[PDB]
Automatic annotation (TrEMBL):
Protein name (database record): Repressor activator protein 1
Domain of life: Eukaryota
Coverage span on the entire protein: 639 to 761 of 855
Region (Disordered): 98-117
């Protein structure tokens, strides 16, 4: 995804905030909308400068400075739709995993069959 490359060597453990994401799920169908004009004049968001972009995944939050992002993350909880929403940073991590192939076998049996006959008999009766 989108992001910026910073000197991870300087503090990889710290994982400095650069961009935040506001998840949506229990918001409901109301999450599909987000009027920008109303959003600008809404719940916490006006407290600090923040780039708000509507997305089907939620609301993108980009801050001009790391400090603003950190203050918003640490003390910028928001309540939207009468629901407290936390600040989730956009970080990615590559994990190493392996999925060995597996095979399964099943027992099979012969269905059998009927051999042909070159002769046949029948009972003759008339009533």
């Amino acid at each position: 995804g989108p992001g910026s490359e910073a000197t991870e060597e300087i503090a990889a453990l710290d994982q400095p905030f650069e961009k935040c994401f506001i998840p949506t799920e229990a918001l409901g169908s109301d999450r599909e909308g987000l009027d920008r004009t109303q959003l600008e004049r809404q719940l916490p968001f006006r407290n600090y400068p923040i780039k708000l972009n509507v997305s089907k995944s939620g609301i993108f939050c980009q801050f001009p400075t790391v400090s603003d992002a950190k203050r918003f993350y640490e003390e910028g909880t928001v309540e939207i739709l009468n629901r407290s929403l936390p600040i989730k940073p956009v970080f990615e991590k590559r994990n190493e995993t392996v999925a060995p192939a597996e095979r399964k076998r099943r027992r099979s049996v012969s269905p059998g069959g009927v051999h042909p006959q070159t002769a046949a008999v029948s009972a003759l009766s008339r009533r």
